[PDB]
Amino acid sequence: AAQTNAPWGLARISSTSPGTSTYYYDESAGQGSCVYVIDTGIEASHPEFEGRAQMVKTYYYSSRDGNGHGTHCAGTVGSRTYGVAKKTQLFGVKVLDDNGSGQYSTIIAGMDFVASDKNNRNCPKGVVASLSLGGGYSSSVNSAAARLQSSGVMVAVAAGNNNADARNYSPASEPSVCTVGASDRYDRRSSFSNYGSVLDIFGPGTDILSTWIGGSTRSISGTSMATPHVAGLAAYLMTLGKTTAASACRYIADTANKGDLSNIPFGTVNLLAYNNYQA
């Protein structure tokens, strides 16, 4: 399938070169997979989600996304126009308040929630969790991400936006999950992207158009935007049967575009997520 005039990041993940604008992908499109977006919520009524999104858990007075961040990330995973995996099922877990903040205890509870809740959902092709969040190093936060991964969920986490080594941030620094840095449309490391040996992969993260609250759209930047590209890619590849939740991060690294990014510090992987779809 071909989506013309796609957001640059979608075109990038199906291309061996920057500078194109059509997204190419297998029409299975993540059908039968599920992606949990652990964030500020999801505006599930947005026409872009087509009834495939729902809130399943909140730790606050509402499950609605009063911020926009979670809706944007969910849109990059799976919206019809802005999403990588256009037929996946999206489940929202609101661990962040409408200012975008959350206590680590709540975030940990949300990860353990997903590890159990997937047993209440129909995801025959597999389960992914997208975590566009983080703070300073916490062994308990890393352990929760490791449990979620161990339970059979492909966990993708943001590297962070500090232009620093991600070893000092959580859950970015957990070795067993997929830690995602950000790139721009010219294949440069995004100016804010964290780096370091704990990164597994880069995805598009500068000037990413996606869904927003109020039935709208906007373009924003962050490792928060790169992470759902990788989460959606995992769901797409799992639906194709090419990989599993336990092996998808490694498979994405195996099949990435290699050595094409600029300003990658010595010791950080130079790997850009790529779907290897041959039309």
| Residue 228 labelled as part of a binding site | no
Catalytic position from the list 33, 39, 184, 210: 39
Give this entry's resolution in angstroms. Answer: 1.1
Residue spans of the domains in the chain: they are: 2-272
To the query of whether residue 69 is one of the catalytic residues in this protein, the response is yes
Is 269 flagged in the annotation as binding? Answer: no
- Rounded to whole angstroms, the Cα distance separating 164 from 168 reads 8
Under CATH, which number does the domain 2-272 receive? 3.40.50.200
Distance CA 51, CA 142 (A): 33
Structure-block tokens of residue 137: 């190093």
Q: What is the DSSP letter of 209?
A: E
Residue 132, phi-psi category: left (phi > 0), alpha (psi -120 to 50), beta (remainder)? beta
Among candidate residues 138, 149, 151, the one with its CA nearest the CA of residue 105: 138
Catalytic site residue from 130, 138, 221, 224: 224
First to last CA, the chain: 7
DSSP string across 22-40: -EE--TTTTTTEEEEEEES
Q: Where are the beta strands (DSSP E) in 132-241?
A: 135-136, 153-158, 169-170, 178-183, 201-204, 208-212, 216-220
Angstrom distance (rounded) from CA 224 to CA 131: 8
Q: Is 16 annotated as a binding residue?
A: yes
Active site residue 39: yes
- Where are the strands (E) in 70-145, listed by range? 89-94, 126-131, 135-136
Contact 8, 225 (CB under 8 A): no
Query: Interhelix angle for 69-78 vs 223-239, to 10°?
Result: 30
Grouping H, G, I as helix, E, B as strand and the rest as coil, residue 131 is strand
Which of 15, 33, 69, 151 is catalytic? The answer is 69
CA distance 278 to 233: 15
Which technique was used to obtain these atomic coordinates?
A: X-ray
